[PDB]
Amino acid sequence: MALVQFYIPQEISRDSAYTLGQLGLVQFRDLNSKVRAFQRTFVNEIRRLDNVERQYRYFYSLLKKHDIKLYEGDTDKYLDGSGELYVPPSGSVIDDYVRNASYLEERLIQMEDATDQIEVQKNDLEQYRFILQSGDEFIAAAIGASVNYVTGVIARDKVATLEQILWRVLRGNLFFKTVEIEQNAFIVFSHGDLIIKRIRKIAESLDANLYDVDSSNEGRSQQLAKVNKNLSDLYTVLKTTSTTLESELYAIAKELDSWFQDVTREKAIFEILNKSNYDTNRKILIAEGWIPRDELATLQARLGEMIARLGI
Amino acid sequence: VEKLLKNNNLINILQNIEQMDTCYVCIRLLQELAVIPEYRDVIWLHEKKFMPTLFKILQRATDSQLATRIVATNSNHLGIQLQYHSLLLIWLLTFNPVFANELVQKYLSDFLDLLKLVKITIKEKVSRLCISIILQCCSTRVKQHKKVIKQLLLLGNALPTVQSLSERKYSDEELRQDISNLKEILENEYQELTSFDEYVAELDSKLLCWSPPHVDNGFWSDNIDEFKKDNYKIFRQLIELLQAKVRNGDVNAKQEKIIIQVALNDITHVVELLPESIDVLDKTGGKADIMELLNHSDSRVKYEALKATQAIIGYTFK
């Protein structure tokens, strides 16, 4: 029924014939494989080998993202419970597997870059929410422009001291220093509208987010009003992304193991068959035989002492 | 030949597919007469009757297995001859260029299946013949060769299929040649149209479809400038068009669902490329419409919708 492919050298050709024999292989004929031009040394199989290397890379990249780690040591058998289930006893069509992994690779790359871009913007605007509210109240210049305020986040009140030290040495005591504890530190410097650049130079060099006005969203009056609606878009758009990713993750985890086992098994067939000259000057016998599929099970039980009984 | 074709008792035998042996002999009888030019003309009059039977044999061939050698069609001796002859019969009549244009336009649905047989089979007799017939219709010499490439590319997604096929070469020089020639023709014919033209032609009909240049970034970059006529008037046209489809003719019915997913894909690409299009979405009200697609059923529409939201979003906050 199903084509099975065996390789050995001619020396254990007899030793092989008997063991195969005792398991229920039929029509055992030793060959080479030149009498099946496609499944012989040619350019064609070598291209298939590349196609499997691409497959291997795609599975690894998808598992990394998913935070599921590779299972290996490999099932390709048909003795096992899992062997029957995660590797179909039928034939393999390379084209289908390539196309399956293509669609998923493309979807993930979108999903992963999109989560990071959406998420970063959200964490910042939620941070600058409280900042613009506190900073306007600290009032009669909340939507002012003739007074300069500098709102800013800083990692801790410790880092803020070092800033205070630069300021006092290099700009004089033209600041009023206030601080509120976050969850970060809200720092506030308050200055003239013509000494901004010099304050800015200090802020850049100690890693502070002291901007003149925090956020690119300011546009309603108050600033905060615009910010709060844009923070409602950010929260719901991140969640939808998380759902599409989750759904697909539960869907393909199981599928990835099955295609991985399938792809391993394709590499092995090509190798058995001789896809390069090297496999040839290492084992010279490749035989052919037909195994009923209701008996496929028993052949895989004994993998073969120095014989490969991995089949279709 | 022409009388026997019209006549009942022989033609009945050929319609039955249950009895592979009888059917095989009869198909071969006709295909051999077709190797001679004159018989092709009478045979093409009667095409309606036999030609569904032949496509059915290829279809049957597809659903069964190849990992046994039972009495039925598999990849046995019996099977290898039935597939070959059917295909060959087709291929013969296709030598006349006019018949081939006609054959694709009527039989389109059935026609698309040959690409499948090419994958599933590992047999250069089946594969080769399938590749050649599709090639011959896509050849320049068939009048309205453009038309048949269009139907095949848009609806049936022939192009992606060929690109996979190209990778798996099988040992047969002529096979490799046919596959390569076919890859060139398909790909070349669609892309080489002007970019602005294809987009607007689709826009006008409100019958947008994904195509190879609408999932490509380069197409959109050249076309941004073409839209500007009153602050991207054409771009605003697509936004109006999308808004309308959701609200009028409802959302969640099949027709309207094809246009939406494609349109959202198209918009996303221009926004990522251009920061000035954000204004257009606000004025029009498109900004609102995106948010609505998110909730809506159909996975593909929701994916494209999410990508649209994110494209606007990246630009609002820096």
Swiss-Prot record, chain A:
Cleavable signal peptide: none
GO cellular component terms listed in the entry, alphabetical order: fungal-type vacuole; fungal-type vacuole membrane; membrane raft; vacuolar proton-transporting V-type ATPase complex; vacuolar proton-transporting V-type ATPase, V0 domain
Main location: membrane
Coiled coil (residue ranges): 104-132
Localization (cell): Vacuole membrane
PTM entry text: Glycosylated.
Cytoplasmic side: 1-312
GO biological-process terms attached to the record: cellular hyperosmotic response; cellular response to alkaline pH; polyphosphate metabolic process; protein localization to vacuolar membrane; protein-containing complex assembly; proton transmembrane transport; vacuolar acidification
Oligomer and partners: V-ATPase is a heteromultimeric enzyme composed of a peripheral catalytic V1 complex (components A to H) attached to an integral membrane V0 proton pore complex (components: a, c, c', c'', d, e, f and VOA1).
Role summary: Subunit of the V0 complex of vacuolar(H+)-ATPase (V-ATPase), a multisubunit enzyme composed of a peripheral complex (V1) that hydrolyzes ATP and a membrane integral complex (V0) that translocates protons. V-ATPase is responsible for acidifying and maintaining the pH of intracellular compartments. Is present only in vacuolar V-ATPase complexes; enzymes containing this subunit have a 4-fold higher ratio of proton transport to ATP hydrolysis than complexes containing the Golgi/endosomal isoform and undergo reversible dissociation of V1 and V0 in response to glucose depletion.
Miscellaneous: Present with 55714 molecules/cell in log phase SD medium.
Protein name, per record: V-type proton ATPase subunit a, vacuolar isoform
UniProtKB/Swiss-Prot annotation, chain B:
Recorded GO CC terms: fungal-type vacuole membrane; Golgi membrane; proton-transporting V-type ATPase complex; vacuolar proton-transporting V-type ATPase complex; vacuolar proton-transporting V-type ATPase, V1 domain
Superkingdom in the source lineage: Eukaryota
Sections of the chain in a coiled coil: none
Effects seen without this gene: Increases the ATPase activity of membrane-detached V-ATPase V1. Abolishes growth at pH 7.5 and in the presence of calcium chloride, abrogates growth at pH 5.0.
UniProtKB keywords: Hydrogen ion transport, Ion transport, Membrane, Transport, Vacuole
Reported impact of residue 250 to A: Appears to have no effect on the ATPase activity of membrane-detached V-ATPase V1 or on cell population growth
Compartments (UniProt record): Vacuole membrane
Protein's GO biological process: endosomal lumen acidification; Golgi lumen acidification; proton transmembrane transport; vacuolar acidification
Major localization listed first in the record, in broad terms: membrane
Record GO terms (molecular function): proton-transporting ATPase activity, rotational mechanism
Membrane topology category: Peripheral membrane protein
Function: Subunit of the V1 complex of vacuolar(H+)-ATPase (V-ATPase), a multisubunit enzyme composed of a peripheral complex (V1) that hydrolyzes ATP and a membrane integral complex (V0) that translocates protons. V-ATPase is responsible for acidifying and maintaining the pH of intracellular compartments. This subunit is essential for activity, but not assembly, of the enzyme complex. This subunit is also required for silencing the ATPase activity of V-ATPase when V1 is detached from V0.
Assigned protein family: Belongs to the V-ATPase H subunit family.
Note: Present with 22500 molecules/cell in log phase SD medium.
Quaternary structure, from the entry: V-ATPase is a heteromultimeric enzyme composed of a peripheral catalytic V1 complex (components A to H) attached to an integral membrane V0 proton pore complex (components: a, c, c', c'', d, e, f and VOA1). Interacts with YND1.
Official protein name in the record: V-type proton ATPase subunit H
Source organism of the structure: Saccharomyces cerevisiae (strain ATCC 204508 / S288c) (Baker's yeast)
Organism classification: Eukaryota, Fungi, Dikarya, Ascomycota, Saccharomycotina
